[PDB]
Structures are given as C-alpha cells and as structure tokens.
Structure 1
C-alpha cells in the first residue's frame, strides 16, 4: 500500500503541471500521516499440522487421509468466528484532534461547519473541497485549487464542481486519472517503484473509463454511428462526430470495438443530451433523425454463486439448496434421507 502511494506521489511530482496532478501533489504532502493507514484491512488466519498427525513413524496412517478435511474445517471455523466482529477501515485512523481542533488540511474551500464529509466516501472528512458550479475560476484561483485558466479545465476534468474528497477517495481519483500506477502493486518485488513511474511518464496513454451516463447512452451512441455523416452534417461542429484526436483506448470492450466509427465516444452525455442548457437542441436533433432519445437508466447486474463456501467444504447445501439448510448440519442425523439418496447416487 505505501509503495503504491509513494509511487503515486513521485508520478504526480513528475507532473507539476496539468493542475489536477499539481493539486494531488499539494494535498498529498499535507495528508501523509493520515494516508499512512491502508484503506482496506485484512484478516489472516492460519492452522498447523505436524507429523504426530499424519504418520505412524514410517508411513501414512488411517484417518490421515481425512486430516485435510479436518484442518480446512478448523480454518473456516475460525474465519466464521472472527467474522462475528466487523471493524471498519476508517476506525483505524486518528482524527479526534484533526476534527476537534481544525487541524485538517482544508485545501479548497472552507467549511462553515467544522469540516466537510467526503462525497465519495461518506464517513471520512474531506480534504479537497470543490466550489459549486456557479463561478469556479474566480474562486478556484483565489483559493488553492488551481494556478491558471488552463489547469482548471484539467482539475474540472476529474473533480466535478462540488465534489468533496477524503484523502483515500482523492487517492482513488488520482489512481483513476491514469490507472497504470497499478504496476507498483500488480508486479511487486520485481521492478523498482521508479522503473514503473519512468515507463509511464515516457509512454503517455490516457484511458476513458465509462460513467453511468455513457452506459445509459449506449444505444444512443450506437444509433448515431449508423448515421455517421447523415447525422453529422446536422451538427458537424460540436466534436461529437469529429476526429479521434489521440489514441485513447479503454477496457470497455464496446467502447473499444466502436471507437473508429465516426462518432467520438469520449463525450460526456451529461454535457450534450443530459445537460440542462443543451438537450432541447439535442431533442430536436434526435427527433429529426429517428433517434430514440436516451433513457437515464442503466442496469447494475450483480451475481454471487450459491453456497460455494459449503461446496469447498464438500457440504451438500450446494446440491440441495433450501431442502438441506446449513443449520441442518449441526445435527445431520435428522435429514438422513436426502443426503443418503444423493450421496449414494453420486
């Protein structure tokens, strides 16, 4: 964790320009002793086994073959018991004096109620406060966020107006800027923390991670690219149907397979057809072309396997989900019938 955060500090210092990287530098130096703590605690449990348990002093044993199914179950038992207490990674930090006594670095705006809460985190206090979208430059510059007019556009590119950030979620934004710093962790033990920063600052590559606006507007984009110029001549002006300037690629397969198809997929729908100053013009444009105006909804599809824990424990609740409860194993003498049937079949 600390190798990643320090490699991030060095990669950001390699870019004292671009505003956002400069703000990241400026607030990292103020929050180290808070950013020392990892944002994600781990639980580690071990289980021991010796030759007293496996061998009759020269060979294997009988009930030695079952020694794994016993130690694995001991391990999972202690995991289950320790999961009875959840401690959150925020409880580890020392903030009493930093909040009671104003000590927090408030680079950005200043709260009129002590400190702000992170909009991305919810619980941690905010370090980088962004003014609301009414007049930014005339504030972003007299405050400490930006230095010029050119650097606001790059700060405003990652931190929307109004986004308060805690050190952890701000570091998350920083990593999201270019997610190639992950090789500090992805490899580890293999290259220096500086080999990688040099490699990244050498071959500059920008990535476009899709927002919920991009997902909601998928079929709209798709229906604009089957009218490549037949819709472009109408606009021809607002960079929606203009050249791919750089060679930006991304992990979104649909974005990656549909980029060189006339329409610039890296526009923000919150700017064009989800905006409040535009989108009437865009309603007209889509009306004039048989374009189904986009819905603001997307699908968050989650899925988890059923009883894979018990399955690794060789239980039968995976096999009979609902019939055999997990609690039915405490005294399995009751449901002898279904287990007998299916186990014998198998």
Structure 2
C-alpha cells in the first residue's frame, strides 16, 4: 500500500496540470499520514509441525497421513475462531485530534459542522467537497477546488456534483481514473515504482470502465449498430454518431467488439437518454424512429458456492446440502445412516 500510494503521488505530480490530478496531488500532499495505513486489513494464522508424529526415528511412523488434515483443521479452526471478531479498517486511523479541532483539511465547502462524511463510505470524514450546484462554474473556483477554468470539466467529469470524498475514496477514484498504476502492486518487488510510473507516464492509453448507465443501455447500443444512420439524423451533430478517437480499449469484452462499428461507446448515457433535459428529446427522436426505449435497469449478479470450506476440509455436507449440515459435524455418528450411505459408494 505504501508503494502504491507513493506511485500515485508520483503520477499525480507528473500530470500536475492534466486535471483531477492536480487535486489528487494536492490531497496526497495534505493528508499523507492518513494514507500511510491500508484500507484493507488481513488476518494471518500459522500452525507448525515437528519431526514428532511424522517420523519415528529416521523414517515415517503410523498416522503420518493423519497430520496434514490435522494441521489444516487446526488452521481452519484458528481462522474461524478469529472470525468471531470483526475489526473495521477505519478503526486503524488516528482521527481524534483531526476531528476534535478544525485541523481537518477540507477542499471545497468548509463544513459548518466541523466535518462532513464521505458519500462513498459514509463512515470517514471527507477531504474533498464539491458543491451540488448554484452556478457550477465559479462556485467550484471560489472554493479553491480548482484554480483555472480549464480543469472545471477535468474534475467535473471524474468527481460528480454533490460528492464528498474521503482520503481512501479519493485514492480509489484516482486509481480508477488510471488503472495501470496497480502494476506497482502487481509486479511485486521486481521493478522500481519510478521505472513503471515512467513506463506508463509516456503512453496515453485511455482505459474505459462501464457505468451502471452504460449497462442499462446495452441493447440500445447493440440496436444502433445495425440501424446505423437510418435513425441518426437529428443526432449526427450530437457526437453520439461520431468516430472512435484513437485506442480506447477496455476490460469489458463487449465494449471491445462494438466500439469501432460507428457508435462511440465512451459517451455516458446519463446525459443523452438517461438525462432529464435531453431525455424528452432522445425519446422523441426514438418515437418517430420506432426503436426500443432503454430501460433504466441492470442486473447485479452474485454467485457464491455452497459449503466450499468443509468441502476442502473433507466434510460431506456439500454432497448432502440441507440434510446434513455443518453443526451435524459435532456428533457426526448421529447421521451414520445418511453419511455411511455416501462414502460407501464413493
């Protein structure tokens, strides 16, 4: 984490002017000792083994195949014993004097109430506070979150109005504006932080990461690819029927075989059809063109296996899911009829 935050500092210093990175540099300079601690904690347990119970005098003994599972169960039991206590990473930080006095650095709205919470964690105090809107062009300069009129767009693109970021939230959003810094944390003590930040500080590879508005319009995109221009007459000059720029390539395999067909996929539909001003317009264009109106709904899909732990620990519960259970393995003889029926034929 130290390496990656120092690399973020370096890269933000390099793009000191390229927008949203002046601010990343400014915050990494302001709150440095906060970011010294990683937003993720780890539990680490350790069981050992001796020559005893595995060797008799100089060769094996009986029950020697019975220690590896024994030690592994020791490890799993110590892990699940620890699991009884949950410590949040935010509890690592020394935020007492920062919040007891107004010595908390706040860019944007100086909070009237000492400090505000971040809208992305809800738990930590914010360091960057962008207004919702009253003018949205000088009110983000009169607050000093930006110094010039050119970085207004540069920041308003990455940090939305009304948003309040914590140090960690901003570090993440920065790593997201440029996802290749993680190579520092990825190559694993093989290069130097400076070598890699200098390797990727030359090339300008605009990585793209979809939003929820992107997904809620997939089949819209897919449609426009076929009905290319027969329904793009009012939208030719709205940069939605424009050209692919240089090399914008993404981890999203669907984005990488529909980007060049003629409809730029790097536009963000929250302004075009998922907007509230340009909405009555795009929908009115699509009525006379008889195409599907996008539905404002995606599907978050999560999958979890069943009983993987005791599967790796040898319990037959993932076989008899529901009938036998984890607790049934405190008196496993009691399910003799239903357990002996299984490994018998296994």
Describe the SS at the equivalent of 2:128: coil
Preserved contact between residue 158 and residue 177 of structure 1 (Cα < 8 Å): yes
Preserved contact between residue 126 and residue 164 of structure 1 (Cα < 8 Å): yes
Q: Distance in 2 between matches of 1:144 and 1:184?
A: 31
Cα distance, 1:139 vs. partner? 1.4
Deviations 1:250-278 (A, max 9, x none): 01111111101111111111111111111
* Counterparts in 2 of 1:226 and 1:133: CA distance versus 1, 3 Å: farther
Cα RMSD of the aligned pairs, angstroms, is 0.9
Normalization by structure 2: what TM-score? 0.98
Describe the SS at the equivalent of 1:136: coil
Q: Distance in 2 between matches of 1:280 and 1:247?
A: 33
Deviations 1:189-218 (A, max 9, x none): 100011110011111111111000001111
Number of the residue aligned with 1:158: 158
Preserved contact between residue 133 and residue 161 of structure 2 (Cα < 8 Å): yes
Preserved contact between residue 16 and residue 22 of structure 1 (Cα < 8 Å): yes
Preserved contact between residue 310 and residue 317 of structure 1 (Cα < 8 Å): yes
Cα distance, 1:234 vs. partner? 3.1
Cα distance, 1:246 vs. partner? 2.5
Q: Distance in 2 between matches of 1:116 and 1:231?
A: 47
Number of the residue aligned with 1:122: 122
Preserved contact between residue 219 and residue 294 of structure 2 (Cα < 8 Å): yes
Cα distance, 1:136 vs. partner? 1.9
Q: Distance in 1 between matches of 2:231 and 2:37?
A: 52
Higher mean Cα deviation, 78-87 or 274-283?
A: 274-283
Deviations 1:5-45 (A, max 9, x none): 00110011001102200011011111111111110000000
Q: Distance in 2 between matches of 1:276 and 1:232?
A: 20
Cα distance, 1:232 vs. partner? 2.2
Normalization by structure 1: what TM-score? 0.98
Answering whether residue 67 of structure 2 is matched by residue 67 of structure 1, we say: yes
Describe the SS at the equivalent of 1:62: coil
Deviations 1:215-250 (A, max 9, x none): 111111111111111122331101101011221110
Deviations 1:279-304 (A, max 9, x none): 11111111122211111111000010
Preserved contact between residue 19 and residue 147 of structure 1 (Cα < 8 Å): no
Q: Distance in 2 between matches of 1:243 and 1:205?
A: 17
Cα distance, 1:309 vs. partner? 0.2
Q: Distance in 1 between matches of 2:78 and 2:230?
A: 65
Q: Distance in 2 between matches of 1:317 and 1:47?
A: 25
Higher mean Cα deviation, 230-239 or 84-93?
A: 230-239
Deviations 1:127-186 (A, max 9, x none): 011011332221111222112111111101100011100000000010000100010011
Q: Distance in 1 between matches of 2:134 and 2:323?
A: 60
Describe the SS at the equivalent of 1:29: helix
Segments of 5+ residues of structure 1 without an aligned counterpart are: none
Segments of 5+ residues of structure 2 without an aligned counterpart are: none
Q: Distance in 1 between matches of 2:239 and 2:323?
A: 59
Q: Distance in 2 between matches of 1:246 and 1:232?
A: 23
Preserved contact between residue 34 and residue 93 of structure 2 (Cα < 8 Å): yes
Q: Distance in 1 between matches of 2:234 and 2:158?
A: 30
Preserved contact between residue 53 and residue 63 of structure 2 (Cα < 8 Å): no
